[PDB]
Amino acid sequence: DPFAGDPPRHPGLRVNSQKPFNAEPPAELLAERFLTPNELFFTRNHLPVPAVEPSSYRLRVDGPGGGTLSLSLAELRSRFPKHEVTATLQCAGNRRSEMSRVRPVKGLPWDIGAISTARWGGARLRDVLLHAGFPEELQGEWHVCFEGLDADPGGAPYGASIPYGRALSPAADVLLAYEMNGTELPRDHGFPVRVVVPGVVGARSVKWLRRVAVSPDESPSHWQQNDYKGFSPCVDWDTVDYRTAPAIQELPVQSAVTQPRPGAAVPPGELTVKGYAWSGGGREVVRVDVSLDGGRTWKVARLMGDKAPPGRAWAWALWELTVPVEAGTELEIVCKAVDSSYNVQPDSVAPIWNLRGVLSTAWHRVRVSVQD
């Protein structure tokens, strides 16, 4: 069994796949803390988890002239000044299950918790590439490709790429992280090294990093070319042409209600509604609107968190709104967020439906009842 060596996990996780392991924290704990504990941070694995001997581990980075720089874990820690970045990773498939309600889709049936937040520590990718000899700027459209140590039966490794400008930008905060919430990277989260690409879909933050290469093209890997793309609601498996849509990089504005949970019976008097909101590309969440009547009337929730610099809001905003609720009533709780570029979320899922079940960002609706 290829998965016998996988790490043990926290028992309260909502698991949608055991082999390979894919799980999310319970929604009731998801937004309990700003930084998601390492043991509850959602886990998305395409393959068996690599077992890595730290001292023999080498990160390979190809230089400008075709040479190869080879770095040990000790050297990655000692050569480059450690930088810390608090960033939220959201999977493209977050909230896929709401989409399947409209019309079945193929994919892991995530609820609202394929998102988590951590303070990451590591070398900046930028410094590693400047050390390998690359310039701050290359002419034209270049990409940085990453391969992981995890590989499918045929030997193809998990891989992804990001544009060269993002990799070299001081402000974009791309890390080759070896620490997570103050401790070393857990195995499920990429030990000993993963890429963390703030403001970008989870798929590009390659775990168990074995190689870094600069190329005039995007990663040729199946997951960069033939997956993690958004299509029209009309497209299906027989018509999809992956050349017609760009690989998902930055993600759009998103939010969900984490408390209360669907089907809850809540006591009359006061109700504290809670959730998260986040947007891609370093775009801050500037407002979260909450409705208790199915989206007819709205109130403004309180945003928690502390501001980040402009263009660098990599971490989610937790929100709450305490409201009066009358005995014997039925509530349809809805939330929608607005970002710093005034992007907003769409009313419904059908018009944004797609065959892969990705980019599920229509309003989250939670129906509960108020007891007598």
Ligand X SMILES: Nc1nc2c(c(=O)[nH]1)N[C@H]1C(S)=C(S)[C@@H](COP(=O)(O)O)O[C@H]1N2
Enumerate the known binding-site residues for Mo-molybdopterin.
Answer: 42-46, 91, 150, 189, 194, 205-207
Binding window for Mo ion (CB under 5 A); candidates: 47-55, 57-65, 200-208, 330-338: 200-208
Stretch that binds ligand X, among 98-106, 197-205, 324-332, 344-352 (CB under 6 A): 197-205
Spatial distance between the Cα atoms of 103 and 350, rounded to a whole number of angstroms = 8
221 binds ligand X (CB under 6 A): no
Give the binding site for a second copy (CB under 8 A): 141, 163, 165, 230, 232-234, 245-246, 248-253, 280-281, 286-287, 289, 295, 297-300, 309-311, 336, 338, 340-348, 351-352, 359, 361
Pick from 80, 142, 158, 353 the residue near ligand X by CB under 6 A: 158
Strand 209-215 and strand 254-259: the pairing is: unpaired
346 binds, among a second copy, Mo ion, ligand X, none (CB under 5 to 8 A by kind): a second copy
Residues 81-100 contacting Cl ion, CB under 5 A: 93
- Does 57 contact ligand X by CB under 6 A? no
44 binds ligand X (CB under 6 A): yes
Nearer to ligand X by Cβ, of 9 and 365: the residue is: 9
Q: What angle do CA 305, 22, 106 make, to 5 degrees?
A: 105
Distance of closest approach, residue 118 Cβ to Mo ion, in angstroms: 16
Q: Are 361 and 256 in contact (CB under 8 A)?
A: no
Q: Per CB under 5 A, which region of 83-91, 211-219, 311-319, 359-367 contacts Mo ion?
A: 83-91
How far apart are the C-alpha atoms of 252 and 159, rounded to whole Å? 23
- Tell me whether residue 131 is exposed, middle or buried, using C-beta atoms within 10 angstroms of its C-beta: 0 to 12, 13 to 18, 19 or more: middle
Q: Residue 146 forms beta bridges with which residues?
A: 160, 212
203 binds, options Mo ion, Cl ion, a second copy, none, Cβ within 5 to 8 A by partner type: Mo ion
Ramachandran category for residue 282: left, alpha or beta (phi over 0 → left; psi -120 to 50 → alpha): left
Q: What is the pairing mode between strands 269-278 and 254-259?
A: antiparallel
Closest to Mo ion by CB, 157 or 202: 202
H or E element at residue 164? helix 164-168
Q: How far apart are CA 331 and CA 353, in angstroms?
A: 26
SS3 state at 224? helix
Of 99 and 273, which CB lies nearer to Cl ion in the complex structure? 99
d(CA 41, CA 115): 8
108 binds Cl ion (CB under 5 A): yes
- Residues 91-120 binding Mo ion (CB under 5 A) are 91-92
Interface with ligand X (CB under 6 A), residue from 36, 38, 45, 254:
45
Strands of the sheet containing 68-72, edge to edge, are: 68-72, 58-62, 209-215, 143-151, 157-163
* 91-110 positions binding ligand X, by CB under 6 A: 91
Pairing state between β 265-266 and 285-291: unpaired
Other residues' Cβ atoms within 10 Å of the Cβ of residue 262? 13
Binding partner of 68, given ligand X, Mo ion, a second copy, none, CB within 5-8 angstroms per partner class:
none
The annotation places the binding site at 42-46, 91, 150, 189, 194, 205-207
DSSP, collapsed to helix, strand or coil, labels residue 131 as helix
Q: Which stretch binds ligand X (CB under 6 A): 35-43, 120-128, 253-261, 262-270?
A: 35-43
In the bound state with Mo ion, the residue whose beta carbon lies nearer, of 108 and 264, is 108
Q: Which is nearer to Cl ion, 93 or 121 (CB)?
A: 93
The binder of ligand X chosen from 48, 148, 275, 282 (CB under 6 A): 148
Under the binding rule (CB under 5 A), the answer on residue 323 touching Cl ion is no
> Which is nearest to 206 in space by CA: 222, 190, 218, 192?
190
The rounded distance, in Å, linking the Cα atoms of 39 and 90 is 17
CA pair distance 319, 300, nearest whole angstrom: 10
User: Which residues of the shown chain bind Cl ion in the complex (CB under 5 A)?
Assistant: 93, 108
User: Which residues of the shown chain bind ligand X in the complex (CB under 6 A)?
Assistant: 41-47, 89, 91, 148, 150, 158, 189, 202-203, 205-208
